[PDB]
Nucleic acid binder design. Structure first.
Ligand SMILES: CC[C@H]1OC(=O)[C@H](C)[C@@H](OC(=O)N2CCC[C@@H]2c2cccnc2)[C@H](C)[C@@H](O[C@@H]2O[C@H](C)C[C@H](N(C)C)[C@H]2O)[C@](C)(OC)C[C@@H](C)C(=O)[C@H](C)[C@H]2NC(=O)O[C@@]21C
Ligand SMILES: [Mg+2]
Ligand SMILES: [Mg+2]
Ligand SMILES: [Mg+2]
Ligand SMILES: [Mg+2]
Ligand SMILES: [Mg+2]
Ligand SMILES: [Mg+2]
Ligand SMILES: [Mg+2]
Ligand SMILES: [Mg+2]
Ligand SMILES: [Mg+2]
Ligand SMILES: [Mg+2]
Ligand SMILES: [Mg+2]
Lengths: 240, 58
RNA sequence: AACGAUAAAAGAAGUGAGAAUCUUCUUCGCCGUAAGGACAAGGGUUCCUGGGGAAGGGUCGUCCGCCCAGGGAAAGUCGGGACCUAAGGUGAGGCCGAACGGCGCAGCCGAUGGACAGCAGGUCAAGAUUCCUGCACCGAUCAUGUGGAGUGAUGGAGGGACGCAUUACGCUAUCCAAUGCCAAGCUAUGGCUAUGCUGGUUGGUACGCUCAAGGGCGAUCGGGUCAGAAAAUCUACCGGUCACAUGCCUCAGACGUAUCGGGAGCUUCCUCGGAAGCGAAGUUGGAAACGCGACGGUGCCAAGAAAAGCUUCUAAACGUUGAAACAUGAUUGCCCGUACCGCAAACCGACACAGGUGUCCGAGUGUCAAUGCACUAAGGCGCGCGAGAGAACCCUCGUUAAGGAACUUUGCAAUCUCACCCCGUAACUUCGGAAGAAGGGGUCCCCACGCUUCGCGUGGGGCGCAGUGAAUAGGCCCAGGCGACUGUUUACCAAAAUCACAGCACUCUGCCAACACGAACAGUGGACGUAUAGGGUGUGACGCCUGCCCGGUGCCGGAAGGUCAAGUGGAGCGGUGCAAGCUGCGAAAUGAAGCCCCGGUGAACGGCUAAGGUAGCGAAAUUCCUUGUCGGGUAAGUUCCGACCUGCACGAAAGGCGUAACGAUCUGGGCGCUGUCUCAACGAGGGACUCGGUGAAAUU
RNA sequence: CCCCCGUGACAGGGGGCGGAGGACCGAACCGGUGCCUGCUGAAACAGUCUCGGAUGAGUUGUGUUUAGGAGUGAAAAGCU
RNA sequence: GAAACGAUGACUGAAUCCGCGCGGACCACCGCGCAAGGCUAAAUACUCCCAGUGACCGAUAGCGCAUAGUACCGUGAGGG
RNA sequence: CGAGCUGGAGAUACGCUUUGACUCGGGGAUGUCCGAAUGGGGAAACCCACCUCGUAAGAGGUAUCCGCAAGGAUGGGAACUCAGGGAACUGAAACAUCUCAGUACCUGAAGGAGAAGAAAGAGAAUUCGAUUCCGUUAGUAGCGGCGAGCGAACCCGGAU
């Protein structure tokens, strides 16, 4: 609703359908969100209003800084219009404050967590997601991620106080095909409804199934798709 | 295809025999009692336009 | 055989070697939300004139969209360009790649979008918002005066700038009425004598103490640098002062005066028919847009392009002695498009083809409404063979005694029903529905009385067989299977019980995500998303639910050990030379993921040896035997419903059972009606037959 | 949203008023259900009649993108 | 293959003339030769074009063409 | 060259030519716009510019890659040449190593030719004396699911 960009639809890369499905949609505009917040250290901002944001799930908050620079931030669960928000290491454990993990107390619930100092927020961004802090190790802090995974994130990285907005994606029951169309194209086309050519679940005489695999080769219910990577050392306890 | 079709070419003989009735019968031409050009029985003489008196122009 | 829609055609006059077919006149009939009119695309001279008459034209041509020659097309303002950007394309530098090449920031290209100055008329044989007449507007260079000092970027900001539904007030285009006005005459068949009949009844511009709904708006001073790269007098933010109504600003449109125009028709000339000259009236009442006022109001979630033009700021620069802005004169006005066809005989369809083709306008009367239906304006057309006949048969129709489904695979087909108003309406239910359930009544004309109209209600009266009097115009019900539902599909034999679906589950994925495209340590999709997210796979609304088996296979997990590759390691055996040396093969032990081995795992592949079916269903879209058996309905029931269980060979997310509503779905029954039938008849039109014209085919 | 009536464990029920919907009927438009016709066609897939959708998962113009073991596919081995 | 020799993608890596490479694993002897820099005419090949000739053709032959890559077909490549 | 010419053109009109037309042989001079295409754009043959000289007409320039600069490169060639990349049908009476074949095709670079070339060689006479080509050795030697089948070189003769 205030100084945004044009998000143009596209589901194919260099030419080909690369992410299966994906189509319809109500033609949305892009709102730039301050995911990092570092440069606004020390400066206080007023919550002008909580706006609607397609592209997200998390409600959007319009910040009116004292220096008159306007920015958008993911609205946390609780933040009301006419409240103050401050960025920088100097920050209270109050809603919407941006403060690095070292200054963040243990047992605290956070969202919009970084991964590398800078870049911007990368974890717990969608509505109702929380990061439970477990307690410091060195430069690194052990954190509980929305999945249940415990990661070693260095205290040098920012976070925002509280859980994400838009309360609950529950009473949202879609309703009918076509509600799903206001967003993404004729969903999941069963490979069992396909032909031998098209997919491995193709063919046979009637309704069936025989070895359980995806579109291309592989296998689908249980198969560690994660690789033998370096980011593994900075990670302790995964599953559930 | 084109369902009933001829089985063999009809010979020059057979084709011609069928045409033994195709000959036109010459009109029975009468001579006009006036203008003296020939005419058709029960019709106005073409030439004078007569049929006892003169009916049609010329 | 056919001559390309069953929208007709008739006569007269003309022309000509020649006339059903060409011209002209008077009729007739067909379209009229089109079969009229205006673009766009596309075609290319098809346009107009004068000629022609081989071939093309399903016949014939004297004619033509054909053939020949000549002509016709006019823009500062309309489209496009010299302006802007979207998807996309390209792209110095740059990132990748046997080559050829692939990517890619800015930038540039790119309308289907933004931006931007002109209207009313006239008329060539053929152009017109282009020419011409009238009176406007836009920008540029200069001149003369006003004016007296800034002007303000390649960068800042504002602004351009955007949805869907619904809706209040005002108006216009436009349309109706009349004993309003103006103009022309005449009518007679019985009447009217005009209060009858026909026709016309205001477009642009300028000004106006005239009316006017609606619509748009804050103005200023100051503070903080931490914001717009910097600067800013511009913008944002915070604070202070006047921010009710109002108050300013804007007039859609109306009215009036003027003026240019047009206007029914009249007037003369007439070389077969056009040119020229003249010109009346301009009322009142009603309706009324998808247009205008306008960026209005409200509601809603799926949250509704960019960039330039523009408006406001300073930077640098020139200048403050000739600034910007205004006003009036002159000058200036580039390139491409413009004919014609354009729902079609000029485009795509091999043809002058019953198809297909994006946008706009699209009058009247009647009918709740309407772009529906009938008729009809304006306009366009009778579909490029014709004429007889009145057989069989075939096509498209009308009626039909008595019967009424007996037809048949099957009421397939074809009737019945049919609009609006009033009464009335079931089981069953997800309480919305089912419902237009079912059923019944009304409907026209005149008069009088009442009111809320365009019209309606009550009373009485009239006419016909009949009053949605013609056209448009649901047959309904009971029970079942399947699928919840709207939707999607096999262009061209399958529309469905297929696929999809909202919902549910398993599962993977921690972000340079999994996964995907790719020559690639490129790049991109996933995603400018981040586990309330994304990939995959299955089931398929909702309700109650989803059991037993982990032996085999797969997946996740452990590791006491066995098995295992290159390599490290070289014990030994062997060649040759006189000899050091040079050389050929080579064990043990060590050496990874894997596999054997152990545990787990079913909304994993599966099963009913690892176990032998929990509910629920069952002769079923599943049952062989089979027309199972008993009951229902029928005069009679291989199908159908219901029970029963002996399930050849049901069964729980390859979901099990049930479920209101939905269905051009499939099965069985009933009412209604009927030419489906007993059993066919009569009648109509179009072929078939006959003549004149033109004249194919497969086959042999 | 505004007036009204209800309290046994209940829920709402009524009046106004609003104007929702992969709601209904129906043109245009998209479509192709059943019959006949056509079957050397008017037509290399059509016609009359009947029928489905008709504010949506809608229809349509331009402009542009993806193709050959490749594309696309509300999935027929369909379309290219 | 007993597979020498050339060649090189990955890893390594020497000698310098009592020196190096070769001689079909490999050794010794005998013998042939100097890599890790570059150029180099002629003999060879082909025929768009030009001339000459022919137990080559003479209009369905011969070039696709007595001339046309035209007419015609196709969106195009192409075909003709 | 020495009288005709005015293209095919079967065609009339106007003319030209012994002060040597016409034609032929050899040079020049003009050569619109497109095309490597090259100022910028572009849907080839069209739009739109700027800079220098100039009285307007009009003339010249404005692409990237090499190098100081002179000067060179882009693009086109029927087949032939070398290079990078490289099929399958087919044979094997099936097929998989093998064959077809390093053929066809694509791509690069170039010329009238190219390629190759001046022995760390051939090779067994202590012969030879750069390369290419032709005959020959020779279907020998050999390779080979030792199958289908594939197939050298030295000597010698010869072109140069
Ligand atoms: C409608 C016209 C259309 O014909 C049909 O479609 C009918 C219906 C079809 O019938 C059919 O295909 N069928 C399928 C079965 C029912 C129907 C049929 C069969 C026989 C007679 N009548 C009808 C044929 C009779 C059939 O022949 C039949 O083929 C059978 C394979 C064998 C028969 N033999 C035994 C005599 C033969 O007649 C064929 C294969 O066609 C499609 C014939 C071939 C020659 C063909 O392609 C024609 C050019 C064909 N295509 C076209 O455009 O026009 C045609 C003539
Ligand atoms: Mg780009
Ligand atoms: Mg007739
Ligand atoms: Mg008779
Ligand atoms: Mg049942
Ligand atoms: Mg269904
Ligand atoms: Mg449906
Ligand atoms: Mg005849
Ligand atoms: Mg209907
Ligand atoms: Mg219906
Ligand atoms: Mg001859
Ligand atoms: Mg030729």
């Amino acid at each position: 609703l205030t100084e945004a960009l044009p998000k143009t639809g596209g589901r194919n890369n260099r030419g080909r359908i690369t992410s299966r499905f994906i189509g319809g949609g109500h033609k949305r505009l892009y709102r730039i969100i301050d995911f990092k917040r570092r440069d606004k250290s020390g400066v206080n901002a007023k919550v002008a209003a909580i706006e609607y944001d397609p592209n997200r799930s998390a409600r959007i908050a319009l910040l009116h800084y004292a220096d008159g620079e306007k920015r958008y931030i993911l609205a946390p669960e609780g933040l009301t219009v006419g409240a103050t928000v401050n960025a920088g290491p100097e920050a209270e454990p109050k809603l919407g404050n941006a403060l690095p993990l070292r200054f963040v107390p243990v047992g605290a619930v956070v969202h919009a967590l970084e991964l590398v100092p800078g870049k911007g927020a990368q974890l717990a961004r969608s509505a109702g997601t929380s990061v439970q802090v477990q307690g410091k190790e060195s430069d690194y802090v052990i954190v509980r991620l929305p999945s249940g995974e415990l990661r070693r994130v260095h205290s040098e990285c920012y976070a925002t106080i509280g859980a994400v907005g838009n309360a609950e994606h529950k009473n949202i029951v879609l309703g009918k095909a076509g509600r799903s169309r206001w967003l993404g194209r004729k969903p999941h086309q069963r490979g069992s409804a396909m032909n031998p050519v098209d997919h491995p679940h193709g063919g046979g005489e009637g309704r069936t199934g025989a070895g359980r695999v995806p579109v291309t080769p592989w296998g689908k219910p249980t198969k560690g798709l994660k690789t033998r990577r370096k980011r593994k050392t900075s990670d302790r306890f995964i599953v559930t | 295809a084109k369902h009933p079709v001829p089985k063999k070419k009809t010979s020059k003989s057979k084709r011609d025999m069928r045409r033994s009735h195709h000959a036109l019968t010459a009109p029975n031409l009468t001579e006009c009692p006036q203008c003296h050009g020939k005419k058709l029985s029960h019709h106005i003489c073409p030439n004078c336009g007569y049929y006892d008196g003169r009916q049609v122009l010329a």
